[PDB]
Amino acid sequence: NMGKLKQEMGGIVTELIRDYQSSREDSLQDAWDYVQAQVKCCGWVSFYQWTDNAELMNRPEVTYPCSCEVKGEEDNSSVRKGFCEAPGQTQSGNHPEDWPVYQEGCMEKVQAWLQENL
Template sequence: CKFLLILVTEFFGILGAVILGFGVWILADRSSFISVLQTSSSSLKVGACVFIGVGAVTMFMGFLGCIGAIKEVRCLLGLYFAFLLLILIVQVAAGVLFYFNMGKVSIPLLIRDYKDSHEDRLQEAWDYVQAQVKCCGWVSFYNWTDNAELMNRTNVTYPCSCEDRSEADDDSFLVRKGFCEAFDSNRTESGNSPEYWPVYREGCMKRVQAWLQENVGIILGVCVGVAVIELLGMLLSICLCRHVHSEDYSKVPKY
């Protein structure tokens, strides 16, 4: 019981470092879809801060539990149990918060307010997503018709990062930003019609949903695995605490 608990506490020390690093990555990352999510939704920022707090507390908790198990200190074992219970509750709350706020991400507003030749971290992140995921818009490329600056162009103009490069030989191209013009000699009418845009037709939402469906088993497996280990740590701490109490009681002199 004692040595198994020591192994569990060491695992939580490593787990805490991973969780803390994940939270810092969410806040610091500037070139992925996570950047778009956490910038356009304050609740996701809160979730990232929760991850950082949980990671720091988990590392401290692992150290606390390890000392308590080695020295067999009931007070530290009790604190370890309480911290484990608190961490489990906070992790569930953070997961629920993230899940119910995914639908509030304002990607369509980002597309509507997108400005050509404008240096903006959020716009750059969205350009990166469209180019790397090979998608255009959120639901479909027609989301870009809500952008007044784009649709007021007289020539065929489209988002550069949406350009369909599926036929290109080189995949390691730099992400293009802003709006690009396409010249079609066969086109007779004027105006910027999206039907003539040489862009990906599929929206990014479908790609994101497909990624989640492909990896949902891994995500759930990791979450369930961590929860099981947390429950195991709680049971072992109670077991060792009762064992220490029994030993202390047996050492009491009897007259």
């Protein structure tokens, strides 16, 4: 019964990544941005699942979710939403291999994070 719930959980997150709109303020989008920023991960299985987001991949520049971006930990903090344009990166289309984002998916890192601190 738990294997069914885990797969349904992964299915919701996958469609959430597909339907993510950078301009809309939504609590479900906020919760996912929080997980990616705090657990330090991108996507569910991998960050390439964000390539199924039509709005993201239609950008002319290297654009990625801001919550996925590799960043240091602040003092007493911390989650940026929406889409971020890569620093320095010609208008040659969106390139996922160029995203300065965490390379591990949140599926694997959340379980490791849970088995480590609780």
